[PDB]
């Protein structure tokens, strides 16, 4: 165990056989600084206030994904193709701030103990899939090497609207819904 | 369910007391098993599991690999601290303190940063401890935290309850009141 005032992940490198596919992000004290959109080859800073201006060439991540891709194939042989174990994710729903009907807020759906890093997180309003007004963090890292993801939903609390968070994962026998209402 | 295989490479920088003590660590992980690692405190690569022995012995032989790993504390950690972390560590977001019943009273302290926080309960200026229950710190994921701290209580007509909050972004504590309905 390492004791320190602060800890940064200037290199959370993920690559998995399913896809195949990977992810590159930097973290500071547990929060996401940025991620590199691997398809568009662009650096995506999540919050321009946590983007203490210093540029990051997207190329540094593609390069690192190559090594990861190569390294995965090597380790698969070295580990006699031992498959990954689907963990059972735990979902929890809560509001950003206190709820005052007729006031703009945000519901947060935390999906913890995720593994492997493949999951579907969508919202439901009275049973209907809430297409937009949604957002998501990348797969954030955990010291036990599993991941956690956080989904957001901006909304106006009312008496005629209930909500749910739908999470689909191989570690679940069926879609799991977490309920929430004013 | 489709079978899967996962690889993880984590580049970590640990900081203590500004930048006086810096420590860098890289971890290679297959699925959920860290098999090899380089810890600047140790100085060379180390197998963490049997499958990492070959890797460590080979990389420790290569003069470039080893020297590069040792130069990481400066080329990456100390470098990034100057370029971005020092600045991020200046981020301050004051907490929002609100009280509301649910006989429980809830001090909902929300939207703050950094994590350091002190929350006390008071009934007529005397601190309440027995009867107080607090959740752990909650990470919103958007660079802000929140924390709920409940108080078991039985209301009387003249009592004044106060939620007292201190945070590094506050020149003076915030105090929100609540009086018997």
């Amino acid at each position: 165990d390492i004791v320190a005032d602060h800890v940064a992940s200037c290199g959370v490198n993920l690559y998995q056989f399913y896809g195949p596919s990977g992810q590159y992000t930097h973290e500071f004290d547990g929060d996401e600084q940025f991620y590199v959109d691997l398809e568009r080859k662009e650096t995506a800073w999540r919050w321009p206030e946590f983007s203490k201006f210093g540029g990051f060439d997207p190329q540094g991540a593609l390069r690192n994904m190559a090594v990861a891709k190569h390294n995965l194939n090597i380790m698969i042989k070295r580990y006699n193709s031992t498959a990954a174990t689907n963990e059972v994710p735990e979902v929890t729903v809560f509001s950003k701030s206190p709820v005052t009907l007729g006031q703009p807020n945000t519901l947060i759906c935390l999906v913890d103990n995720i593994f492997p890093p493949v999951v579907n997180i969508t919202w439901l309003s009275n049973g209907q899939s809430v297409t937009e007004g949604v957002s998501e963090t990348s797969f954030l890292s955990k010291s036990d090497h599993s991941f956690f993801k956080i989904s957001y939903l901006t909304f106006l609390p009312s008496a005629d609207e209930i909500y749910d968070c739908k999470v689909e994962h191989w570690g679940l026998d069926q879609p799991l819904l977490k309920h929430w209402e004013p | 369910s489709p079978e899967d295989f996962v690889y993880q490479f984590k580049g970590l920088c640990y900081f203590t007391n500004g930048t006086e003590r810096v420590r860098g660590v890289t971890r290679h992980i297959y699925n959920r098993e860290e098999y090899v690692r380089f810890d600047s405190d140790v100085g060379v690569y180390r197998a963490v599991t049997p499958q990492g022995r070959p890797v460590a012995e080979y990389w420790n032989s290569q003069k470039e690999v080893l020297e590069g790993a040792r130069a990481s504390v400066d080329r990456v950690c100390r470098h990034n601290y100057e370029v971005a972390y020092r600045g991020i560590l200046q981020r301050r977001v004051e907490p929002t303190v609100t009280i509301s019943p649910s006989n429980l009273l809830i001090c909902s302290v929300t939207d703050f940063y950094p994590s350091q926080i002190k929350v006390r309960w008071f009934r007529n200026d005397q601190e309440e401890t027995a009867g107080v229950v607090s959740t752990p710190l909650i990470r919103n994921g958007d660079w802000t935290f929140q924390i709920l701290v409940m108080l078991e209580m039985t209301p009387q007509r003249g009592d004044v309850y106060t939620c007292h909050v201190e945070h590094p972004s506050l020149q003076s504590p915030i105090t929100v009141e609540w009086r018997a309905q």
Partner: T-cell receptor
Amino acid sequence: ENVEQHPSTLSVQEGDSAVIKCTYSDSASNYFPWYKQELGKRPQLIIDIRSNVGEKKDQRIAVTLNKTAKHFSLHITETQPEDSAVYFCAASSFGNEKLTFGTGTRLTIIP
Amino acid sequence: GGAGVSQTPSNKVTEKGKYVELRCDPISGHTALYWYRQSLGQGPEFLIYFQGTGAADDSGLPNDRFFAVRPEGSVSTLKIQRTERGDSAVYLCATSALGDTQYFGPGTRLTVLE
């Protein structure tokens, strides 16, 4: 991006000195190697310099760097016939390890 | 590989439309391998960059008729299909222990005739 190299051709008397100047565009550049190439042969790495030093000498060869101005030069002193060849400067960045070369300079040392 | 990066043969002459393959045996140990193209009068220009078995950067590939491989993070092969007169140039190969300091091979001059 762009590495500008001058002069395109150079003729110098055996014994005299030769200088090749280059200007790069990306300030992110941190590695500046130099290559010597002989007819029908590949480029050979002869010397390099990183953004953390302004000068570096190695025998008859010398290279300089000015990060602020984005100029880096090559110095061959006391040139000898074997120095006749085409030279190239190049630039690399911490994040992009691919090299972007200059147009080259055909150096001819008159015996 | 050996002490230096090898590229044989030094010359390959063919005509428009044929299929051509160029091989590169890297310096033993080097994990990074590049391919560069050189039209004479000019300096080398980037084509593709390999880290181990996979491509880390293939932005330099002129068009879809070019494709390279390094099935074992060792010897690499640049394949060109339905060759065109405009593909004539010297194809240089370079390897690096980690990626930055690059060492070139003798190169292979590809001459495509009508």
